[PDB]
């Protein structure tokens, strides 16, 4: 996240690290068992880590369990990243309590202007280079879909919204990959590619939940 704030630990109880000997992507909590991320943050091995502030530092609240199962998205393209949307199972349940909670799915998708609560651990700065070890926070609005059209045209599906700021500063980055944008308490968004960070008129763009709400239930519902 650049431009953003430490948002406090375990303020954001759905957050979570996907870790393979270190952390590579976020992820958002939806049941005790399973886990949204992006389909481009697929591999094998997987553990999830819920719980987390310091991702460096063992501060007594994590819960590390191992993914039985990944599910991507059966329409995930990998070179347009349309549909990129994936679901991990874990071995064991989680314990939930206030620290690691369960974020609700839409029940419609959210509008332009609607306010979210985007999160990670991906890199701070717009040049260069510096991974938080602390999870950082950025409040931004969903852009429309034309000006989200003509800010990266030819690239923008159906399936996509864009949420920051036109004039750059504020944005998602490398590292939060996976993880979520929640808006008035449901998970709207999941962090998915931008060209560079916090540039002007490149704002970030999100996997747009609402989309895949009956995939997710029939998929769990069933695996
Ligand atoms: N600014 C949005 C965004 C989201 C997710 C990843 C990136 N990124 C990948 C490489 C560099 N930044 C950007
Ligand atoms: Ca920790
Ligand atoms: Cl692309």
Redesign the pocket.
Same mark, same amino acid.
């Given at each position: 996240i650049?431009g953003g704030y430490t948002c406090g630990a375990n303020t954001v109880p759905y957050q979570v690290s996907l870790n393979s000997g270190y952390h590579f992507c976020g992820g958002s909590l939806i049941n005790s068992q399973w886990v949204v991320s992006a389909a481009h943050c697929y591999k094998s091995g997987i553990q999830v880590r819920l719980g987390e502030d310091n991702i460096n530092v063992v501060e007594g609240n994590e819960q590390f369990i191992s993914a039985s199962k990944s599910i991507v998205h059966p329409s995930y393209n990998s070179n347009t990243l349309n549909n990129d949307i994936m679901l991990i199972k874990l071995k064991s349940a989680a314990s939930l309590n206030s620290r690691v909670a369960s974020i609700s799915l839409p029940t419609s998708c959210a509008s332009a202007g609607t306010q979210c609560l985007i999160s990670g651990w991906?890199?701070t700065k717009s040049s260069g280079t510096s991974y938080p070890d602390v999870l950082k926070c950025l409040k931004a609005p969903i852009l429309s879909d034309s000006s989200c059209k003509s800010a990266y045209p030819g690239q923008i599906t159906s399936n996509m919204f864009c949420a920051?700021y036109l004039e750059g500063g504020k %944005? @998602?980055?490398?590292? %939060? @990959?996976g993880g979520p944008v929640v808006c008035s308490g449901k998970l709207q968004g999941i962090?998915?590619?931008?060209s560079?960070?916090?540039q002007k008129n490149?704002?970030?763009?999100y996997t747009k939940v609402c989309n895949y709400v009956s995939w997710i239930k029939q998929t769990i519902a069933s695996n």
């Open positions: 650049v991906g890199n920051g %944005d @998602s980055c490398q590292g %939060d @990959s962090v998915s590619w931008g560079g960070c916090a490149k704002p970030g763009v």
